[PDB]
Ligand binder design. Structure first.
Ligand code: PGT
Ligand code: PGT
Ligand code: PGT
Ligand code: PGT
Ligand code: PGT
Ligand code: PGT
Lengths: 799, 799
């Protein structure tokens, strides 16, 4: 899907650029500049106002999603999440940070579930998507003649299509209303409908109406931003209709911004009626104001909140896995876009004239080319930044400063230089955000990032051909080094960019194959065992089974056991070591899964590492609850119903003649354990002789055994393998672990772990007999929240 | 001394600047520029060659010092130390990194003693100093008429003075040769002479001659650098004579470079004969070529070796305390000098003309002023860099980049911008070098750094008055903002610099008084005890006496006990904690001693921290040797004469009826210990009840006791207080500690410490009875290696 999807995305973008070139054949870059200058200042204020209103409406859009999801959030939190998710989501789309990914980060702080947020994301997306046909049909149904003239279709055709769409909408509404199950309601404003296979959660009448009213205002507001920037305007009905169709086309095309396809359609519709230059100026300004501007504001706002959090909560925040890294990848990617577009466009004659006297003329040429190569590097380095490489941080920050300098030496492009500097200043402030010391050369290949770069370089060649159309091409142009020669400086830069990008991408893709997964050897198992001993987490003992691969840190103070099943790679617990080592190992595991084209899954993780799992792009799903008794507050002279039941079990066990013995590793009765294991029925001598075995006996004869996970410290201790005979008494087992607890209380262990119950009722009650302290255990899995998949699933179930 | 010395240094510099202004009254900056352009290219090559020869001679100068000191070093090491120490020493003098400080750092790697190096430094300095009168006299004695005409003195006078100097030199040589003690010789090429009070170590005849021949060539070579840059030249005899006198005056004046006083004297001598412009051009070029150039080369070379060491030895080097920090302080200080001098000098009319079209004219003014303030900040921040503040690193690196930018916006000063950029690029490479996270606002006041800044700002106003002499001053000049107005841009900058410098210096000096030293409270003692437990070093137990101040880290994972005696502040051991915590605490202690105007002394330190003590500017003196027995290789079934003597002592002790008992803290027989302490004669219950006490008894009655320093780990354990009765057997004590060793061997301790012997013979033998492992213990003290003090001491002893 990914490769095909990405290819058909690039084609669409490419075809759209061709379309835009043909539609602006009769216009020169002069006429565009004049058209941009022409639009009055009241119109720009009108646009900016309409933009502000149109982004306030999206907050209410976010509120409705929370009501649907049954999520209570503070107003300031909904506001921020509404704005940032819609502002970044609309701009960069899927390429970099998406709407869902923003929502999830932001709304994980308040303890909103991963399921809820997903259901908030889906509702935010689908509600526009599914309203867009209805809104369009209605728009066309006012003044059909104008709509017909705009689309250049027969009046009868567009009439029946609109009617058909409305009728189908009504028929669908009536159908899903038919299967409305009464009684139960997930949220105040929701329904649960049934179709036979799956239950489906739909908004209520009131919420559906309200959402449609919000969607209506939002569209209108957005279309109005464009409508005000047009000197001469068509009837608004037809103009809205077209805008909605262009918007649809942009969405379907899966082009990040909608860029190219949107413009192409608008241009197509109103090529002749309005004229190219006014429309093309309006479309550019519309993009800057309604798309780029709120993105920058959102980016800044999120960086600001990050910076604040670092300033106030200095102690709490340690490893830094927040918003700075994605946001700064975006800004650095935009910085590379600026550099590349700047180069394609010719310079101001006045500036070149004067800068010719300050600089050697042949250095202008050199500066111009180098700036364009740095631009390409900036596009690719954006990935490295996203993955929190310190190398990437340093190299970027150098290239931005050199790029800002060569911006001044090129054509005194002080606007480009100012943007690049400002990006550098931001990137600098967040040095600690990029904390991984991995090599840049070991970043896994990302088709998306390569696809994006190719698009940008494509756009820049489109701009080159448009901006330098006044010159007659010739073979000699390539070798002209003058000052007045602006076209040759474009050409050479263009070729340089394309070649470097091609080279890097080939040098990235044609790389050595990654080594195969192998079970650990004796040395590794011994090194794992060492780490486990000099650590807190005893659950790490399962590593020493030697049936699952071990991934070691560079410092070799930490490791992370995992195993490949099907197309996924399941890690068994959190990494084993300090917080920084844990963060580096989680990133290492992402890297390792990306190199093997496998889905990174983490099994049974604690809540303390959930932000790091968020960082590499996983969602925490509530797997099960792990019960662990506290030995500090546990005493055998206390009172309680369950405590009295336990003391009864204990004393009855002692009177019966049950005895408990502890054997250190190496001196275990292997013959007995084998016989017991066989009677019950991994169990290997190598695995068993790593741990201390507690054996309980009934009147001398061994009645059960259990190996004990334990570290050199006394913070925690667990049990993994534990088998009892069918013929053994029922209270013997309960006596056993009670004996284990007593022994650990004598040794002065802080805590003791029993185990995890998933979702079992009998096991849950049995654990609850000791009155333990519960703690949630999560599962980490990738975030598969594609609107299209969900809509296709809904449509399939409905049909 | 320091304040007086610094004041009389500034006065001399000031008076010299006045002198230089008066001597260049008849010359304009035009005539100087022409004179600089005039000097031919063969002459510059001749100068550069003579410089290279004159720095090769200094290597042989360094060799002779090693022979005198009796130090064997590799040729490449002598070379580097010769060059760097003479190149930096000559340039910056005493202000920043000095010759001795370079030698000590460089020659500590090879395990050259602190005493040796000091003796190498003194010999390197004094040999020139004491040869300069002889060389001068001899020079004057060739062609007396020319020498008389140059000095404008009578021929008879200069004749008798020269003769007197030579006669006194011969008479001194004969006198010190009289008291030449035969037999013993510290080195092959040395003598030991006696005068009654102190023994004095002088070079041999052969070494004295050779040194004089080296000194002769070196001077000649240096004078020749200047002689070639003169179009019209006086007789070389007289020219040399003057150069030596000017050199003397420069040295005596204690002006860092010799700058001002040297030029003043040369100028004075050859004002009229040669003409101002040629001479003043020669003197400037001489400074650049023979002083500034080798300094930059040395700086680069030392940075290169640092960079290499970081690249190759990544694992070994951890905390980074080498050459980068001092060297980069110098470069940053020079960067501030460039900015300040650039501002005082008017701009090129051509560049302003063209840059007027690219920039707003009133932004040139703003850029010009801001650049001059950044210059001043750069001068002061140089200190912060030296003390390895990360804040200083970040702030500098920002100011250098902004300063480089405003250099371009000012008058397109692309040379200033290039230097500043290059400094920034270097500073960036060594980010890790500046690792302390202290506040900038808490740096202690350094009069020297303030004095240096005032000199620079003084020089810049001297340059302002010289470079802008063509304009008529008026009150209105201050308020003229034009483009062609270069003098007002100087004035405003000058005033701004002076005011900012004054303000900062007052804001630095008038600061709150530092809190007084107080003994620790119960909480601190308890927190110290905690640290000691969770650590390796048990010697830290002496902290819990509570008679000595404790200095804690910010993390509170480390501390450093110290006590004030007289005018010094003695720390008792190394800091207690990790390597990074140790480095930060040592710097903290330097800071604390600088705020109380006390000499930082470290007592009984290990060799592992010696580089950090080097960093804050201490010299390791061999205090004593600490013996610690290794329990891994120690066994009671081994063979050996001493081992058989120990086993005999043990079994005889057991048969006699000696018994050893171990009491945990809290359950000590206080009554007994008190009685034993009284019988022997800090001893307090609070101090005693922190440690486990081992009590040996003779037939039941307690015969001795000894508290045991110990941590939670088993890496090491010691004994501090240990008293025995006069009437107790002689072998009872030896049995006691043997019992202690046996007990620690049973507990599985890695090592065990006995104690330190200073320089005692009986104690040394007693320790050697157990066949221990010796390890040197050092004392850290400031480096008081002022040539003048040593010469005054020598002169006083001779007389
Ligand atoms: C780092 C330093 C980069 C080079 C700085 C400028 C070089 C010295 C100035 C000079 O003479 O440059 C020549 C520049 O000549 C060149 O060939 C320039 C290319 C070399 C610089 C390439 C990197 C520049 C951008 C980074 C101009 O001579 P011309 O070719 O106009 O004469 C005919
Ligand atoms: C009309 C002319 C206008 C001139 C411009 C005037 C205004 C300039 C204002 C610039 C201020 C922005 C720079 C702030 C960056 C944050 C500093 C920082 O933290 O830097 C980090 C990175 O280190 C740096 O030094 C980075 C320097 C890069 C800064 C780049 C931005 C300045 C750009 C200036 C113009 C450059 C030239 C462009 C045109 C060619 C170090 O972080 P740390 O955590 O390691 O250390 C913190 C320390 O412990 C204290 O707590
Ligand atoms: C034309 C619209 C209709 C058809 C659309 C379909 C075809 C798409 C392909 C082309 C789309 C973009 C074309 C126009 C974009 C701007 C062109 C432009 O002017 O580019 C300038 C440079 O390129 C841009 O400005 C690109 C703008 C787009 C992206 C901007 C992102 C902003 C953020 C960047 C990172 C900074 C982050 C820190 C800030 C918080 C260079 O030209 P200049 O002559 O104006 O500049 C020279 C001199 O400096 C001043 O005159
Ligand atoms: C950070 C940004 C610093 C300012 C960048 C330039 C300001 C906009 C350009 C402009 O109009 O500047 C005026 C600059 O006006 C000023 O007053 C300049 C001083 C403000 C800048 C001070 C800091 C500059 C150096 C850093 C020029 O107008 P005029 O005063 O020549 O008109 C009469
Ligand atoms: C004719 C035009 C010529 C144009 C110039 C062309 C040549 C430019 C070459 C510049 C290269 C020098 C910069 C190298 C600096 C070392 C990078 C570095 O390590 O930076 C540290 C500081 O971080 C930075 O990003 C500092 C950036 C500052 C660099 C400043 C020098 C460049 C100046 C360019 C011109 C600026 C404009 C001047 C005029 C206004 C980060 O160290 P770290 O240990 O934290 O990270 C290491 C990582 O883990 C990998 O192992
Ligand atoms: C005059 C000599 C006899 C009398 C001496 C007694 C009086 C002493 C007081 C003055 C001493 C210095 C006077 C002359 C120094 C240089 C003057 C000069 O030219 O200054 C320029 C700037 O100042 C300097 O160059 C100062 C040089 C001295 C210190 C240099 C240190 C070098 C290292 C700096 C740090 C960089 C580190 C990285 C490199 C490895 C600005 O003038 P400009 O018109 O030449 O420049 C404008 C334009 O850019 C090009 O024309």
């Amino acid at each position: 899907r990914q490769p095909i999807g990405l290819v058909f995305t690039l084609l669409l973008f490419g075809l759209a650029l061709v379309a835009c070139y043909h539609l602006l054949r009769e216009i020169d870059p002069g006429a565009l500049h004049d058209a941009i200058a022409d639009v009055p200042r009241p119109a720009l204020l009108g646009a900016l106002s309409a933009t502000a209103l149109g982004f306030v409406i999206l907050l209410g859009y976010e509120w409705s999603a929370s009501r649907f999801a049954g999520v209570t959030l503070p107003m300031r939190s909904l506001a921020t999440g509404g704005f940032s998710a819609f502002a970044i989501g609309n701009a960069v789309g899927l390429s970099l940070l998406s709407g869902g990914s923003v929502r999830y980060r932001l709304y994980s702080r308040h303890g909103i579930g991963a399921a809820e947020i997903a259901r908030m994301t889906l509702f935010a997306s689908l509600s526009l998507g599914c309203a867009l046909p209805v809104l369009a049909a209605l728009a066309a149904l006012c003044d059909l003649d104008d709509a017909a003239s705009a689309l250049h279709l027969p009046r009868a055709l567009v009439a029946v299509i609109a009617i058909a769409v409305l009728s189908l909408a009504v028929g669908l509404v009536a159908f899903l209303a038919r299967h409305r199950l009464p009684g139960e309601r997930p949220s105040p404003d929701s329904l649960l409908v049934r179709l036979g296979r799956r239950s489906l959660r739909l908004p209520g009448l009131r919420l559906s109406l309200l959402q449609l009213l919000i969607t209506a205002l939002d569209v209108a507001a957005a279309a109005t931003v464009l409508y005000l920037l047009l000197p001469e305007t068509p009837p608004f009905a037809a103009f809205l209709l077209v805008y909605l169709l262009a918007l649809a086309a942009g969405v379907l095309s899966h082009v990040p911004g909608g860029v190219g396809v949107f413009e192409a359609v608008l241009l197509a519709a109103f090529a002749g009626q309005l004229g190219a230059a006014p429309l093309a100026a309006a479309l550019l300004l519309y993009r800057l104001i309604y798309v780029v501007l709120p993105l920058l504001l959102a980016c800044l706002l999120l960086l600001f909140l990050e910076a604040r959090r670092l300033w106030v909560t200095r102690q709490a925040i340690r490893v830094a896995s927040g918003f700075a890294a994605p946001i700064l990848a975006i800004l650095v990617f935009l910085s590379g876009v600026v550099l590349l577009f700047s180069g394609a466009t010719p310079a101001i004659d006045t500036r070149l004239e004067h800068l010719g006297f300050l600089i050697p003329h042949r250095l202008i040429d050199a500066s111009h080319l180098v700036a364009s190569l740095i631009g390409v590097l900036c596009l690719l380095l954006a990935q490295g930044l996203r993955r929190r490489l310190s190398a990437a941080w340093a190299l970027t920050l150098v290239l931005l400063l050199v790029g800002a300098l060569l911006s001044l030496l090129k054509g005194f492009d002080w606007e480009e230089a100012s943007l690049l500097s400002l990006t550098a200043a931001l990137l600098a402030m967040f040095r600690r955000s990029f904390y991984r010391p991995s090599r840049l050369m070991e970043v896994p290949f990302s088709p998306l990032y390569v696809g994006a770069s190719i698009c940008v370089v494509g756009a820049s060649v489109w701009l080159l051909l448009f901006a330098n159309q006044d010159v007659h091409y010739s073979n000699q142009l390539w070798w002209q080094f003058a000052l007045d020669a602006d076209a040759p400086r474009a050409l050479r830069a263009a070729l340089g960019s394309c070649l470097l990008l091609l080279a890097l991408a080939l040098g990235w893709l044609l790389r050595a194959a990654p080594p195969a997964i192998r079970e650990p050897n004796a040395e590794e198992l011994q090194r794992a065992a060492r780490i486990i001993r000099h650590s807190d987490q005893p659950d790490g003992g399962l590593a020493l089974t030697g049936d699952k691969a071990l991934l070691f840190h560079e410092s070799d103070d930490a490791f992370l056991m995992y195993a490949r099943r099907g197309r996924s790679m399941i890690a068994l617990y959190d990494p084993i070591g300090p917080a920084m080592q844990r963060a580096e190992l989680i990133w290492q595991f992402r890297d390792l899964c990306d190199l093997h084209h496998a889905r990174p899954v983490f099994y049974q993780v604690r809540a303390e590492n959930l932000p790091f799992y968020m960082d590499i792009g996983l969602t925490a799903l509530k797997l099960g609850e792990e019960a662990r008794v506290d030995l500090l507050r546990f005493d055998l002279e206390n009172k309680g119903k369950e405590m009295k039941d336990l003391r009864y079990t204990w004393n009855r066990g002692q009177r019966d003649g049950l005895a408990l013995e502890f054997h250190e590793p190496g001196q275990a009765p292997l013959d007995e354990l084998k016989a017991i294991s066989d009677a019950w029925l991994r169990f290997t001598p190598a695995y068993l002789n790593f741990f201390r075995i507690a054996i309980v006996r009934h009147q001398g004869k061994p009645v059960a055994f259990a190996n004990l996970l334990e570290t050199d410290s006394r913070e925690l201790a667990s049990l993994d393998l534990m088998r009892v005979h069918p013929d053994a008494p029922k209270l013997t087992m309960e006596f056993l672990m009670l004996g284990l607890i007593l022994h650990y209380k004598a040794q002065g262990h802080a805590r003791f772990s029993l185990g995890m119950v998933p979702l079992f009722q009998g096991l849950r009650r049995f654990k609850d007999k000791f009155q333990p302290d519960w703690e949630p255990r999560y599962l980490a899995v990738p975030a598969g929240l594609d609107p299209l998949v969900a809509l296709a699933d809904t449509a399939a179930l409905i049909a």
